[PDB]
Enzyme design. Structure first.
Site, PDB file in Angstrom:
ATOM      1  N   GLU A 166      -9.877  -0.017  -1.951  1.00  0.00           N
ATOM      2  CA  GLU A 166      -9.497   1.379  -1.784  1.00  0.00           C
ATOM      3  C   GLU A 166      -9.642   2.195  -3.076  1.00  0.00           C
ATOM      4  OE1 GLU A 166      -5.731   0.455   0.030  1.00  0.00           O
ATOM      5  OE2 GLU A 166      -6.817  -0.353   1.756  1.00  0.00           O
ATOM      6  N   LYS A 180       0.834  -1.199   0.000  1.00  0.00           N
ATOM      7  CA  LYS A 180       0.000   0.000   0.000  1.00  0.00           C
ATOM      8  C   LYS A 180       0.884   1.270   0.000  1.00  0.00           C
ATOM      9  CE  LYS A 180      -4.041  -2.403   1.808  1.00  0.00           C
ATOM     10  NZ  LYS A 180      -5.188  -2.340   2.745  1.00  0.00           N
ATOM     11  N   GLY A 182     -11.889  -3.014   8.574  1.00  0.00           N
ATOM     12  CA  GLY A 182     -12.083  -1.791   9.325  1.00  0.00           C
ATOM     13  C   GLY A 182     -13.469  -1.427   9.787  1.00  0.00           C
TER      14      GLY A 182
END
Lengths: 243, 244
Positions: free
Chosen positions: A94, A10, A168
């Site tokens: 993402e 990432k 998350g």
């Protein structure tokens, strides 16, 4: 089906820390019947490829859908290959959910990357509100269909299921991972071919640690992992040996 | 105000072709009163910095707003500096209009990049529909205000006006229309920031510029240089470096 472990670094690391991590990976024994791929930040694709031993492949974390053009901030599949990388991660959660990349765009990217000779790690996944509404299958099947419509040859493709609903305060059990992976392989079997269903790796892109990886890997339809930022730790070597 | 020429290579080039281009830039004489910056594709920032002579600085074409995190596909200001680059282009028209980057996000990026010690080339501009409605000032002032609210020290900032209304639409912008926007922009800085910032901040032109037009554009009182697009990959770029 060869075990497939992808480490998505990432937006983390610098030359010094990443160089250290690379030395640990170069020193590790990759088991038989195992394929390891590392996806550095875009600025370090070239750096990582020069430092990593050929036994570990390098992936870009994203790319765009034409070879060259007026697209400030993007990179093409041609640039990725020119830096010695052989994979690209496409449609990561993402990119879809923070950066608004549509299914249409992801499909166009898949097609261009494959046409340019790259391998593709194609990511799919449903959100919490989608799961609680009971449209997990509808969502992941529509995402997988858009990918499949843009894939001629599946030998260069790996599917990654990201349980976004659990990335998350909710955690996903190994039974819930298996259930999605089997429905996904069932989809491939019906809509592509049995040969593609049998041979295509479907890897788990949820939360995985050294203490969980073994049970997850032993699931019949889980073929490996796409690990997040935890792939930067010593822990990543345990995940490589999850079988 | 030191003359400023930025070459935005956008999504173009390969090690071989870019290496050739770099050799031509290394061989060219950079004038005394001139600051030259090149923005390669992200995959080649490091490559370009190692090949380019120190007389040309390197810029990233984009960055994100935190130092590290779970943002697949992005790079931070820390990574850009770690590759030896000293600038970042932020809020380019392609990030705003192809990739949907909001003013809020661009503001946050400006603040983080400056706090991390990078220079920022901050881009602004109005579309055709905005210009034809007569809200050119409203648009570029709102964009400049969001930048200004996130800049503590302007010495590391260069403003770039991109006439998006004239990039790729069949309309061309005259040197008089460039001057008019640059002067209104400097007027805004003078009133809303300070006279010192207005007097010292470079406002560069990000519209279509060629070897035959650069000298007239550069001689305009409030045009301090250029942010060139894909034309910065041609021999032509060296003529633009010598526009003054």
């Amino acid at each position: 089906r060869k075990f497939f472990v992808g480490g998505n670094w990432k937006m983390n690391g610098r030359k010094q820390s990443l160089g250290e991590l690379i030395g640990t990976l170069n020193a590790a024994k990759v088991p038989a019947d195992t394929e390891v791929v590392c996806a550095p930040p875009t600025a370090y694709i070239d750096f990582a490829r020069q430092k990593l031993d050929p036994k570990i492949a390098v992936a870009a974390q994203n790319c765009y859908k034409v070879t060259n053009g007026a697209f400030t901030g993007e990179i093409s599949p041609g640039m990725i290959k020119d830096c010695g990388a052989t994979w690209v991660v496409l449609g990561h959660s993402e990119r879809r959910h923070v950066f608004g990349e549509s299914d249409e765009l992801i499909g166009q990217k898949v097609a261009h990357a494959l046409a340019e000779g790259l391998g593709v790690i194609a990511c799919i996944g449903e959100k919490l509100d989608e799961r609680e509404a009971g449209i997990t299958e509808k969502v992941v099947f529509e995402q997988t269909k858009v990918i499949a419509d843009n894939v001629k040859d599946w030998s260069k493709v790996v599917l990654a299921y990201e349980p976004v609903w659990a990335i998350g305060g909710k955690t996903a059990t190994p039974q819930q991972a298996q259930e999605v992976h089997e429905k996904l392989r069932g989809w491939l079997k019906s809509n592509v071919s049995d040969a593609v269903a049998q041979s295509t790796r479907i890897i788990y892109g949820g939360s995985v640690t050294g203490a969980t990886c073994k049970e997850l890997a032993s699931q019949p339809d889980v073929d490996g992992f796409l690990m997040g930022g935890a792939s930067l730790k010593p822990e990543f070597v345990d995940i490589i040996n999850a079988k």
